[model samples]
Target: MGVQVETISPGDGRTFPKRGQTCVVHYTGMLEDGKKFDSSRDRNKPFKFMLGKQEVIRGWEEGVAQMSVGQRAKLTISPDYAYGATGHPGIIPPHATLVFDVELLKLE
Candidate 1:
């Protein structure tokens, strides 16, 4: 079974953070069964990204920019924005729904 996605923030396509923009975030990743797969909180860590640096996934670069600092978001990512068809072995499956809790850390 698949999961449903809901986008809480609408991206203007302009919020895409540029290279060297530092951003801090909080996130949780889960399977369709609602099983928690990954979370930054679990490690007592927060995600920090340098936007447009290619250091992170393209979807992350695309998604986080639409947010403001301290904004909490839930993003529904499609296959195009996630691991496509073949999927990552043992972690993510192809055509699976990817959800995230994102907070924009900062913008350069």
Candidate 2:
């Protein structure tokens, strides 16, 4: 998994989520061509998951781990970090590179 991160708005916060800590995030997932596939904002709620728990994709874990609370960033994830050779049916394609606009909303 080759995940690249670029901080867009480094939030004025002191703490970043660590492994085993819970995180709340809002994200929009898209393809290289900029086709939106999913968004937590569209669902009217942030997504909560434990870091390094494998509850989400490897790219998300790697990318979100670098964020501080209230931070905003963009992540470019390679196929090995995303859905890989077998992508999410009907949502993503095989070996597709994913682009994510992510905001770190909270840490619990």
Which parts of model 2 have CA positions greater than 4 angstroms off?
none
Q: How do all models score by TM-score?
A: 0.75, 0.94
Best by TM-score: 2
- Candidate 1, 6-37: lDDT as tens digits: 45554443454556788877788775557777
lDDT string for model 2 (29-75, tens) is 99999999999999999889999899988988888887778899999
lDDT of each prediction vs. the true structure?
0.67, 0.91
Judge candidate 1 against the unseen true structure and give its global Cα lDDT, from 0 to 1: 0.67
Q: Name the TM-score of candidate 1.
A: 0.75
By lDDT, who's the top model here?
2
